[PDB]
Ligand binder design. Sequence first.
Ligand SMILES: [Ca+2]
Ligand code: NA
Length: 258
Amino acid sequence: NLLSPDRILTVAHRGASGYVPEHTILSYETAQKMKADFIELDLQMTKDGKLIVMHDEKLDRTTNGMGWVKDHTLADIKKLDAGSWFNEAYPEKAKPQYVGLKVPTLEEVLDRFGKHANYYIETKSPDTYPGMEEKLIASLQKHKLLPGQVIIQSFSKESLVKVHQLQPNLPTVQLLEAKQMASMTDAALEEIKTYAVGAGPDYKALNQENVRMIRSHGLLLHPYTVNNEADMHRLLDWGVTGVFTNYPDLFHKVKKGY
Ligand SMILES: [Ca+2]
Ligand code: NA
């Protein structure tokens, strides 16, 4: 099954974001067609309390809007162009159909794919957007998704502990920045295992030894953000159990050898 350590998972990071503007319905659809195991979502909360999918706290990078998501209503956000930025940033990858792509709500992504997709969803520290975890859980329940159907990822330990006590059968993954992974110990991994099924470190901090160490605690191991073929091979040879990639078709091809 999806949470088996012997299964290698393709997590399409913000969808097929290497080819399609990140965190759009089209990006996720493309990831699905490319046979990704999971589509990956980041959440922000609007002024009127709605969960939308966006990586940054600000609209600036990926829309023609400006400012903090939480200062804008959903209605105004839905007017924005969340695709043209990609054509500008990567002119060699530009496509006319990317003009006018919209920011989706969490609700729209879940409604779009239902049980036909598996979702890898980020939460924030609970103080960032109060009630985010509860709204997320309720949205998942609405679409009858509450395993491996949904994995919750977060840098925030408190968020994952909260999730784990609210929904004990909702798999979580502790995200780890480079320096955190650099100084990882068996004790810390043992702590992580009490609420999380896996770890998700910056892949740059990985080597054979600490990969073996994470694996020794029976934890899943999904480094981010792995886009280069050479790195895919090295990490799989070391023993990671999946990756976050912007190029899910490439990783699909590579992992067949492992
Ligand atoms: Ca991510
Ligand atoms: Na912009």
